[PDB]
């Protein structure tokens, strides 16, 4: 329950449990290129490249790479997701885009045939442009709707070879990058009433999609529906400071509490949010909160570079920033009553330099895994999946192609942009197969 | 499945509202039209949620198109009707979320209303 996770401020064990569900992931903007082939609208962030920053993997022309690769790691599912506006180039759903339909179904199609369940993400931060430019995108409380018909759409044509469903891939950055900051599309800087109306509609559409795969959909297909939730961890300064401990509490809160405590805890912004932020938080109608409470299937958790990089990505209030994978899972155990747990996004980055010899990489995996396999087996996490973070390189947002997180190299100066395997591509590949470390 | 209702007569310059009424999973709702020695030709149709709205420019600007799927309703609130929006007005659903103005897109269809704009 709310607040429970400050008690956790005061190689064991190979194998993972049996049948253990071992994924790997990427997102459109990152690694599809083609941002206007075949009739795609543009997105925010194909503006605020032009704009702000100064082909990239090209999987939309080379799906067969793509799925070799996957062969090759011997993955049990794969996290992509779709383009909204490659399939409805204008955002609303009026006539679908043909060929961006065909790209998505023919990627479906080849991981069914080869038994890899798809794990599909409806929103990673590509937002049609022309629902930016008409209403203010997620400033307006139009999307939500918008944003259900696209997914109802999604739900239909791709529902029955889908299983797991991501509404949206960290909307803390969404809301806090893209209009806090200024870093991510669309750029808005300060506007800190901005900031928490992007998320309040975010959680909305959430809850209104989950509401409507519940309802409509889940009866005969089957699946289940979640929302990619990313945070740092953090540690106090001073081990016995309960002044330290209750700005940890608060530095979590404010990055993950105010998204899983209306999704994932009892519908409502965390207390302390809703008091010190009162002028800026909207305010949750007593229907809404039993609206939000419990709209997601399984505790879909992101913790990534992107969750510590840049500086002012979160406030530290203080404290001391950490990498313990470990102790963010018990938080989450502790403040959400102990949900089923999808790490949805997992790894770091090298600089663009590193080619193959992603020496790091394996470093902060084996890390990782070693931390997921003690929360499981020691502290009773039911951490159930693991996704590896990307399966190639791309775009990495605001920094471009200067940092690699892909476990399959891309020559970006290549025209054929083969998929090389990494060192971690080959020590991932045999984790998968060892189910674990090796023997 | 789907139930008509509204028409009538009007004076040129008028408002008429028609409504249709499913019987129940979302769908597209549609309104199309035959006048008098013309083919049936489209009218208006909504997304399941409402956020995509899709005219005829025949009709765009004077007809307003909503729905309520808690009284699994769709309504075409028609203002400043003219003698040439006289015809029989169907309704016609559509499964898949995707707003078209084509006909054989609508596998579901009403039993036509009368509306008749007089001058």
């Known amino acids: 329950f709310s607040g429970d996770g400050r008690a956790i401020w005061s190689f064991l064990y190979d194998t993972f449990p049996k049948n253990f569900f071992w994924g790997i992931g990427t997102g459109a903007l990152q690694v599809e290129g083609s941002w206007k082939k075949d009739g795609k609208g543009p997105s925010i962030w194909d503006h605020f490249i032009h704009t702000h920053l100064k082909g990239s993997s090209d999987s939309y022309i080379f799906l067969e790479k793509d799925l070799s690769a996957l062969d090759f790691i011997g993955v049990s599912f794969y996290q992509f997701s779709i383009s909204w506006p490659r399939l409805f180039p204008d955002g609303i759903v009026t006539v679908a885009n043909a060929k961006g339909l065909q790209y998505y179904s023919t990627l479906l199609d080849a991981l069914v045939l080869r038994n890899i369940e798809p794990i599909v993400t409806l929103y990673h931060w590509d937002l049609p442009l022309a629902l930016q430019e008409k209403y203010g995108g997620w400033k307006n409380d139009t999307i939500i709707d918008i944003f259900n018909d696209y997914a109802t759409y999604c739900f239909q044509m791709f529902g029955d070879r889908v299983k797991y469903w991501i509404t949206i891939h960290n909307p803390y950055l969404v809301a806090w990058h893209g209009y806090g900051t200024g870093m991510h599309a669309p750029g808005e800087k300060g506007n800190l009433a901005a900031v928490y109306t992007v998320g309040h509609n975010l959680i909305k559409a959430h809850s209104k999609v989950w509401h409507n795969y519940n309802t409509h959909f889940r009866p005969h297909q089957k699946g289940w529906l979640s929302i990619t939730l990313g945070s740092h961890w953090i540690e106090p300064n001073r081990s016995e400071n309960t002044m330290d401990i209750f700005k940890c509490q608060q530095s979590m809160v404010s990055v993950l509490g105010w998204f899983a405590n209306p999704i994932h805890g009892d519908g409502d912004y965390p207390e302390g949010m809703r008091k010190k932020l009162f002028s800026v938080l909207p305010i949750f109608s007593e229907a809404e909160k039993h609206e939000m409470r419990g709209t997601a299937d399984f505790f879909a958790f992101s913790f990534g570079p992107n969750n510590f990089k840049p500086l002012n990505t979160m406030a530290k209030m203080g404290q001391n920033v950490s990498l313990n994978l470990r102790e963010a899972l018990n938080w989450i155990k502790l403040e959400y009553n102990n949900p089923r747990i999808l790490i949805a996004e997992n790894g770091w980055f090298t600089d663009s330099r590193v080619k193959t010899e992603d020496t790091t990489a394996i470093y902060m995996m084996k890390n990782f895994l070693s931390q997921v396999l003690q929360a499981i087996r020691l502290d009773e996490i039911r951490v159930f999946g693991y996704t590896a973070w990307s399966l190639l390189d791309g775009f990495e947002w605001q920094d471009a192609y200067t940092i690699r997180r892909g476990l399959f190299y891309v020559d970006f100066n290549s025209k054929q942009k083969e998929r090389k395997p990494k060192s971690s591509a080959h020590y991932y590949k045999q984790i998968i197969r060892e189910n674990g470390f090796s023997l | 499945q789907l139930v008509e209702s509204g028409g009538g007569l009007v004076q040129a310059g008028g408002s008429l509202r028609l409504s249709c009424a499913a019987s129940?999973?979302?769908?597209?709702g549609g309104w199309f039209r035959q006048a008098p020695g013309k083919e049936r030709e489209f009218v208006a149709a909504?997304?399941?949620?409402?956020?995509?709205?899709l005219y005829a420019d025949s009709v765009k600007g004077r007809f307003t198109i909503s729905r309520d799927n808690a009284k699994n309703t769709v309504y075409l609130q028609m203002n400043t009707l003219k003698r040439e929006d006289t015809a029989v007005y169907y309704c016609?659903?559509?499964?898949?979320?995707?707003?078209?103005?084509?006909?054989?897109?609508?596998?579901?269809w009403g039993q036509g209303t009368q509306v008749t704009v007089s001058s």
């Open positions: 016609a659903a559509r499964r898949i979320n995707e707003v078209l103005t084509t006909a054989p897109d609508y596998d579901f």
């Open positions: 909504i997304s399941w949620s409402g956020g995509t709205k």
């Open positions: 129940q999973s979302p769908y597209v």
